[PDB]
Amino acid sequence: ARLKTVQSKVTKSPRRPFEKERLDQELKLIGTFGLKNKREVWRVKYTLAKVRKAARELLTLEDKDPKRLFEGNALLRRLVKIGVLDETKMKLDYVLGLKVEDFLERRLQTQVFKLGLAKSIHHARILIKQHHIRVRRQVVDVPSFIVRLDSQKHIDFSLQSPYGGGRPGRVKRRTLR
Amino acid sequence: MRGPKKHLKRLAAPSHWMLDKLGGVFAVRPNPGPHKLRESLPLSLFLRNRLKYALNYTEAKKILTQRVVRVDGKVRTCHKFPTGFMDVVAIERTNEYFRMLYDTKGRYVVHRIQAAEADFKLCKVKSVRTVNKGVPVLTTTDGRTIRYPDPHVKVNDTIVFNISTQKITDSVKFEPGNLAYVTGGRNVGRVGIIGHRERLPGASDIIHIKDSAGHSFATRISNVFVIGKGNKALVSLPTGAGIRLSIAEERDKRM
Amino acid sequence: GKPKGLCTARKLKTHRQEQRWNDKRYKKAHIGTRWKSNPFGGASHAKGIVLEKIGVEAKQPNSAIRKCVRVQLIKNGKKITAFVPNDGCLNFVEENDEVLVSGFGRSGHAVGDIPGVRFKIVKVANTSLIALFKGKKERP
Amino acid sequence: GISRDSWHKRYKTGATQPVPHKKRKFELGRPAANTKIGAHRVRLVRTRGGNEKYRALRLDSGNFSWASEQTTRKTRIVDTMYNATNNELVRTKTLVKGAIISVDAAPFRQWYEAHYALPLARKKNAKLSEEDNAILNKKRSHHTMKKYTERQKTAAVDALLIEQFNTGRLLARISSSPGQVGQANGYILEGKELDFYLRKIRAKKAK
RNA sequence: UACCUGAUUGAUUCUGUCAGCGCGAUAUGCUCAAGUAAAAGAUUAAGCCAUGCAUGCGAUUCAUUGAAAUUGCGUACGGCUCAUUAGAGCAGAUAUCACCUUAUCCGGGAUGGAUAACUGCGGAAAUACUGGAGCUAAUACAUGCACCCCAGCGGGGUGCAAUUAUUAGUGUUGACUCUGAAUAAAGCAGUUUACUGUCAGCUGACUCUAUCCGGAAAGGGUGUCUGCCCUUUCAACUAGAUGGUAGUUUAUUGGACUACCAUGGUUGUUACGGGUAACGGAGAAUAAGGGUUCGACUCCGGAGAGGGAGCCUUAGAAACGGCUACCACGUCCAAGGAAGGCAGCAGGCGCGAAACUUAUCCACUGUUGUAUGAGAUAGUGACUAAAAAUAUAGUUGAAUACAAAUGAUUCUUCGAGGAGAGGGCAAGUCUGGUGCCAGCAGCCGCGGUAAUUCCAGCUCUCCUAGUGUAUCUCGUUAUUGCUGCGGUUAAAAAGCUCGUAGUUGGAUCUAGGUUUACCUUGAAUAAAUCAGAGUGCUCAAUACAAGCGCUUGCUUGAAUAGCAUCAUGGAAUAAUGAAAUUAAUGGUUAAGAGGGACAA
RNA sequence: AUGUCUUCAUUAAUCAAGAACGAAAGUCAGAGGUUCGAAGGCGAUUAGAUACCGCCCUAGUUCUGACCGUAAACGAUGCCAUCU
RNA sequence: CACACCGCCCGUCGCUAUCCGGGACUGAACUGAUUCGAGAAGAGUGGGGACUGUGCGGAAACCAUUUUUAUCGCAUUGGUUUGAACCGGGUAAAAGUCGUAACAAGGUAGCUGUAGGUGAACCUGCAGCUGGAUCAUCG
RNA sequence: UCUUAAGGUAGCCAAAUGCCUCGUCAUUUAAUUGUUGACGCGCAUGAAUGGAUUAACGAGAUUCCUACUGUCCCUAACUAC
RNA sequence: UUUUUUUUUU
Known part of the structure; x- marks a missing residue:
């Protein structure tokens, strides 16, 4: 009958629940990039850990190994398209140099306020929540949505949102009536 | 179980x-028939996926009940008919002819052919024997039995079979230097020139085949299918000419 | 020293198996009488009936009377002593009550200054002891 | 019922074997035919796959073969003489493959005389009966007599066989399984085989 | 991310465990904005079950299109569960020259009599109970339409399959008592279309039905090699047991069974016995590497249908939504009799720490395709996985979707809790109560009238729609150590020696100028899962898609990686063999190994 | 052990099962029984003194033939080879 | 020993709680095997011939026997669980009784094996060990 | 504390030895002054006046289970003398 | 020559 459904975890808990250094460093990451909870930062840590581990495992191999070649260019390609790796810095010895801040910057929430669409990062988030941003003619409502390089310059207000042309919001309509 | 099985889980x-x-x-x-279950394809699947002429499995049956699909010159109305390797599927209404061939990966494809190609097919001589009344026959790998073949035809050879006349036209001999198709194993879908033959007496002989790109590969004789004399194929081949592109070469070609 | 030859796999494997039995964890997990000896029979909790309320003198250097209760388990009829945690919670437990009992935390060993008690009460009359203590729920 | 399963036996080492399942149909057995000498009686058995077997319970006529002469005649089973397996089968007149029996010699004698046009150890003082004369003293053209003259060249018959023909009962061996095919076809003993079985029979009679 | 921290002492360094700490499974406490996927009476009781469903659809149509009934086909697949089971079962390779097959593929082969529906007469309290009387059909039932011998004038026999025997050697396979060709009888019971609808023009062409023979395919039965749990408080076991001959049975081989005969067969390289809270595998959890633990459960194989046993029908069943009996336990009786098998779906009772609606449909995947509790939908659902609101949801009517719905998606009306706060370990020596009491406290320890530890208020800390507790697995753990532990005193060298199995064994044969073992490379090697390539499901977990023109279309992806067997090459290392008419005729050296001799 | 220009030529190391030896005490049988001496009995000491101290002693201590197979049977260190 | 000799500490006895062992009772219960006795039902065979087709045929009940063999009886045996008078061991538990065994030469150095004795720790004999209170004592 | 030459040791027990006594508890039975196992301040057990065990043996004393039966319920018939 | 003990927690 029905088969097993595939599920995966995207977060790994820290080995030490209480260390002041880690707690401060993670709270600062929540601060700069407006996040919701520690799971939000552990998710990025986990993705970065996967990337770094894959790079290390490939680098254990010599330069012209078939697997090394294929997987290395694939990984570098994905990172470039996300905008996390430097398009001149095409190597795994250099992909083993990234930080959680690189990934956290490419989030839609950060770009919304970085490009001026919103004042504060919290403003960016509540706009993305209330469906006032669109990407390449698509209303994205996920503050964690990553912005590819191509999508970087094609993000503006929704064509419907009252701040992008549309029926006035509830407050305005109440006042008008 | 207590008897034959009728289902097949996805x-x-x-x-x-x-x-x-x-x-x-x-x-x-x-259904049982000319081709083995693992090395065949239901006529329902052929229309459902490879051709997209039918949206669902009721539509496949609706199409096939009209008596519009011919396999090896005979009309087949069963959606579970096992079409397999080197089978001529003719849809007269749309004037379309295909030959069921293997992709380099090892998958069935949609190889559109012309009437001249569709008039014949190749078969591998699985046995040569003498039936009652002392008349010679040869049995192919697709179940066909042909009476009165050329006495020079031996096992493992390829015979050109004319669908219209139900007669053998030519015989290509399984010897080094002839073009060969690989139907099973991990080298399925690859085409090359037969090379050395390791003669294992009580087991399956081993055949080394070198393609046009210079790549060599071995396989078992039961997976080799001669498709021409020298280097000339008696039938056409799908885009790729049975050349196993490497994984890097595939990406480079795509880009 | 241990054997090191290239053909001593059997000796190494057999010796490892022989010596694994001298390990408390392995023997405790494979002895065979675990189910018949453990009062819960390998379960985490068990329902039982309260027989009486007893007081256990705390070990030294502490001094107190821990309010425990004697319980008879329904599944096998074995008698155990369970601790009633929290303050004044022995009042909630009446005689001839159906109580859910759980382990005390150390996998069948006494905890703290309470001697010989390896179980604690979780529910009484199908009501959570914590809920009763916090006032969330009341005695059925 | 009767089973042919390999389990229920001990192992090579003498260990008791585990029973894998309940008795399966495809490993069944059936009661033995135990064919006897008597009026023809053959029952039909439905076997696996819809096929059929012929369980012969009683048989009297057997379609036996003379190998040296390369012929086959239908004679009648008279009695059972020797059985390698067990004497009880001989004493109860059981027709089983490989059993030595006594069959009528007259059909073979008739064939011999009609084929070579010569007597087969005919009696030394008795005139041939009319039916014999119809095939022995028959008169046909020399064209046909040429064929018989050619065949008379190779006509010597072994003395041990002639002695059996004198008694009129021939020692034969059953070469079929009456319980499976429903017939008792066999072949006439001759040569070293005949000497062997004759010596066995005579020794057992002497004892 | 190849990691540790607290606790024995007045203090110190160790051994060593306990405790902490991370993940997962199950249960459970408290608590839960909307949505999306999705596990779910396995654990104990393969315990017991009220009631509904879960298997039905060419020939024969004098009923009213097609009912009823007779045929034929299917119900041996599918669904469930994991009790039994330790050369059983499974995994990989491999035979069947020892076998059996419906459905599907390829070759070859216008006869007669009776029975139902129907009419009618009845019995029983009671069954899907049935006896008589009168008709009537078939795709039911029956019948069936060049060589040998005698005699070369002429007579007979020779289809396929099949029994036995014999003859010569028309193909094959590594090899055939195989397949062909002949000869002889005989019985053998199978078979070589009295079918439906027909069409075209005496000549043609189809569909259907029936039907054997040979070869395939698919399925099955057995056979071989290698691997697969604990236990010596199990060391010897085995008597149809091991083998031979002849038979019997079977579809076939076989001590499968019988008659006679021989004395064999397994075992410290662990037989035999016992245990298993034991179905095997694919796989799952944890995870530097090496591993440890588990795997009832959607896929593959096996087994069972309350426990046994026996059988009918059939191509296929030792079938149980088939029958027959016994055992245990039920049901209805008018007491004469008649019945039952949820470990199918849904529900109920028991059992327990522990698990959902007596709902809608064949629209989807499939079953030969109207029928499908298989399957698909919706219900209950803090098992679980992903994404997200509490600041800077609800609600109305449409469309869409669907088999009908629901829900999402498009529009439009109004409109925050769980643990903690001495240390480990982030966070109060704030206030009030209580005075070794009540209580807390995983561990160390708090409390004896001035408690940062109890009970409260206020404040903080961690995580957060989740957060705690209990049991268990893995890490931690070099506290099972092959990698990789330790044995003077912390636990641990046998009192000592001899000795079989086991383990391990010195150097030495082409340097220069026959077997194995081992290594390399290939072959054979189901998916799902894991790794991994591609691809804006709005992201993600997932999924396997999709992306371009312009309409009559083109091009695509759905990769690749992941013991034993066979072959290829390599000839170091480690075993193993050769010799006690000509030619160099054939014995490595003699261990700062061992044994023996001789001296004093 | 040493000496050896003797001999054999890998016959070796360690060893589950298996076997010999194995202090003292102890057991069985037969002899001996000096000394010392468990147990026992006395005299002291003591709060008591079933002990230390003193006196008289039984088994034993000794020999022969059998058992037992244990010791702080200890260098609390297994054996073989090799280097510093 | 470190609360530092007014230290620490060992046994018997007494009270409470709890776990386990032995135990008369041919104890009891559950479960699996094996021998033997009986034996349902089916299937095979030999009879039989109600009934009905043409001296011939088909055939139901029934009878006999072979085989598979459930099931029931004793009997033996393996494995689990368990009652029990009484007799004992172990452990735990703030402030019981008796003594002083050990740690200093612990006031008789301590300990090992063995044997005997005694309320209890323990004492004594024999032979060992230093883990001793001597790394030593003059030839 | 009185006291003896010594104050009954190891064992065993309501025994063929215990008055009280049909001791008390358990076992056997529906029911037991009986049996067996325990307890022991034992009127008045006890170590070659030998103590405690003990396989095999017994026309020895005792209790129970099974088989069997006219011993009995409850008697009847038959034969020889 | 004789020379036994020292409640619980802190």
Whole structure:
């Protein structure tokens, strides 16, 4: 009958629940990039850990190994398209140099306020929540949505949102009536 | 069990059929016939996936009940008919002719052919024997038996079989230097020139084949299918000419 | 020293198996009488009936009377002593009550200054002891 | 019922074997035919796959073969003489493959005389009966007599066989399984085989 | 991310465990904005079950299109569960020259009599109970339409399959008592279309039905090699047991069984016995590497249908939504009799720490395709996985979707809790009560009238729609150590020696100028899962898609990686063999190994 | 052990099962029984003194033939080879 | 020993709680095997011939026997669980009784094996060990 | 504390030895002054006046289970003398 | 020559 459904975890808990250094460093990451909870930062840590581990495992191999070649260019390609790796810095010895801040910057929430669409990062988030941003003619409502390089310059207000042309919001309509 | 099995779970279906995992619990179970279950394709699947002429499995049956599909010159109305390697499928209404061939990966494709090609097919001589009344016959790998063949035809050879006249036209001999197709194993879908033959007496002989790109590969004789004399193929081949592109070469070609 | 030859796999494997039995954890997990000896029979909790309320003198250097209760388990009829945690919670437990009992935390060993008690009460009359203590729920 | 399963036996080492399942149909057995000498009686058995077997319970006529002469005649089973397996089968007149029996010699004598046009150890003082004369003293053209003259060249018959023909009962051996095919076809003993079985029979009679 | 921290002492360094700490499974406490996927009476009781469903659809149509009934086909697949089971079962390779097959593929082969529906007469309290009387059909039932011998004038026999025997050697396979060709009888019971609808023009062409023979395919039965749990408080076991001959049975081989005969067969390289809270595998959890633990459960194989046993029908069953009996336990009786098998779906009772609606449909995947509790939908659902609101949801009517719905998606009306706060370990020596009491406290320890530890208020800390507790697995753990532990005193060298199995064994044969073992490379090697390539499901977990023009279309992806067997090459290392008419005729050296001799 | 220009030529190391030896005490049988001496009995000491101290002693201590197979049977260190 | 000799500490006895062992009772219960006795039902065979087709045929009940063999009886045996008068061991538990065994030469150095004795720790004999209170004592 | 030459040791027990006594508890039975196992301040057990065990043996004393039966319920018939 | 003990927690 029905088969097993595939599920995966995207977060790994820290080995030490209480260390002041880690707690401060993670709270600062929540601060700069407006996040919701520690799971939000552990998710990025986990993705970065996967990337770094894959790079290390490939680098254990010599330069012209078939697997090394294929997987290395694939990984570098994905990172470039996300905008996390430097398009001149095409190597795994250099992909083993990234930080959680690189990934956290490419989030839609950060770009919304970085490009001026919103004042504060919290403003960016509540706009993305209330469906006032669109990407390449698509209303994205996920503050964690990553912005590819191509999508970087094609993000503006929704064509419907009252701040992008549309029926006035509830407050305005109440006042008008 | 207590008797023959009539179902075939989707996950148990052959991988090379390339069915989708979440597309129901069952898959069309081919009927017994010319081709083996693992090395065949239901006529229902041919229309459902490879040709897209039918949206669902009621529509496949609706199409096939009209008596519009011919396999090897005979009309087939059963949606579970096991079409297999080097089978001529003719849809007269749309004037379309295909030959069921293997892709380099090892999957069935849609190879459109012309009437001249469709008039014949190749078969591998599986046995040469003498039936009652002392008359010679040869049995192919697709179940066909042909009476009164040329006495020079031996096992493992290829015979050109004319669908219209139901007669043998030519015989290509399984010897070094002839073009050969690989139907089974991990080298399925590859075409090359037969090379050395390791003669294992009580087991399956081993055949080394070198393609046009210079790549060599071995296989078992039961997976080799001669498709021409020297280097000339008696039938056409799908885009690729049985050349196994490497994984890097595939990406480079795509880009 | 241990054998090191290239053909001593059997000796190494057999010796490892022989010596694994001298390990408390392995023997405790494979002895065979675990189910018949453990009062819960390998379960985490068990329902039982309260027989009486007893007081256990705390070990030294502490001094107190821990309010425990004697319980008879329904599944096998074995008698155990369970601790009633929290302050004044022995009042909630009446005689001839159906109580859910759980382990005390150390896998069948006494905890703290309470001697010989390896179980604690979780529910009484199908009501959570914590809920009763916090006032969330009341005695049925 | 009767089973042919390999389990229920001990192992090579003498260990008791585990029973894998309940008795399966495809490993069944059936009661033995135990064919006897008597009026023809053959029952039909439905076997696996819809096929059929012929369980012969009683048989009297056997379609036996003379190998040296390369012929086959239908004679009648008279009595059972020797059985390698067990003497009880001989004493109860059981027709089983490989059993030595006594069959009528007259059909073979008739064939011999009609084929070579010569007597087969005919009696030394008795005139041939009319039916014999119809095939022995028959008169046909020399064209046909040429064929018989050619065949008379190779006509010597072994003395041990002639002695049996004198008694009129021939020692034969059953070469079929009456319980499976429903017939008792066999062949006439001759040569070293005949000497062997004759010596066995005579020794057992002497004892 | 190849990691540790607290606790024995007045203090110190160790051994060593306990405790902490991370993940997962199950249960459970408290608590839960909307949505999306999705596990779910396995654990104990393969315990017991009220009631509904879960298997039905060419020939024969004098009923009213097609009912009823007779045929034929299917119900041996599918669904469930994991009790039994330790050369059983499974995994990989491999035979069947020892076998059996419906459905599907390829070759070859216008006869007669009776029975139902129907009419009618009845019995029983009671069954899907049935006896008589009168008709009537078939795709039911029956019948069936060049060589040998005698005699070369002429007579007979010779289809396929099949029994026995014999003859010569028309193909094959590594090899055939195989397949062909002949000869002889005989019985053998199978078979070589009295079918439906027909069409075209005496000549043609189809569909259907029936039907054997040979070869395939698919399925099955057995056979071989290698691997697969604990236990010596199990060391010897085995008597149809091991083998031979002849038979019997079977579809076939076989001590499968019988008659006679021989004395064999397994075992410290662990037989035999016992245990298993034991179905095997694919796989799952944890995870530097090496591993440890588990795997009832959607896929593959096996087994069972309350426990046994026996059988009918059939191509296929030792079938149980088939029958027959016994055992245990039920049901209805008018007491004469008649019945039952949820470990199918849904529900109920028991059992327990522990698990959902007596709902809608064949629209989807499939079953030969109207029928499908298989399958698909919706219900209950803090098992679980992903994404997200509490600041800077609800609600109305449409469309869409669907088999009908629901829900999402498009529009439009109004409109925050769980643990903690001495240390480990982030966070109060704030206030009030209580005075070794009540209580807390995983561990160390708090409390004896001035408690940062109890009970409260206020404040903080961690995580957060989740957060705690209990049991268990893995890490931690070099506290099972092959990698990789330790044995003077912390636990641990046998009192000592001899000795079989086991383990391990010195150097030495082409340097220069026959076997194995081992290594390399290939072959054979189901998916799902894991790794991994591609691809804006709005992201993600997932999924396997999709992306381009312009309409009559083109091009695509759905990769690749992941013991034993066979072959290829390599000839170090480690075993193993050769010799006690000509030619160099054939014995490595003699261990700062061992044994023996001789001296004093 | 040493000496050896003797001999054999890998016959070796360690060893589950298996076997010999194995202090003292102890057991069985037969002899001996000096000394010392468990147990026992006395005299002291003591709060008591079933002990230390003193006196008289039984088994034993000794020999022969059998058992037992244990010791702080200890260098609390297994054996073989090799280097510093 | 470190609360530092007014230290620490060992046994018997007494009270409470709890776990386990032995135990007369041919104890008891559950479960699996094996021998033997009986034996349902089916299937095979030999009879039989109600009934009905043409001296011939088909055939139901029934009878006899072979085989598979459930099931029931004793009997033996393996494995689990368990009652029991009484007799004992172990452990735990703030402030019981008796003594002083050990740690200093612990006031008789301590300990090992063995044997005997005694309320209890323990004492004594024999032979060992230093883990001793001597690394030593003059030839 | 009185006191003896010594104050009954190891064992065993309501025994063929215990008055009280049909001791008390358990076992056997529906029911037991009986049996067996325990307890022991034992009127008045006890170590070659030998103590405690003990396989095999017994026309020895005792209790129970099974088989069997006219011993009995409850008697009847038959034969020889 | 004789020379036994020292409640619980802190």
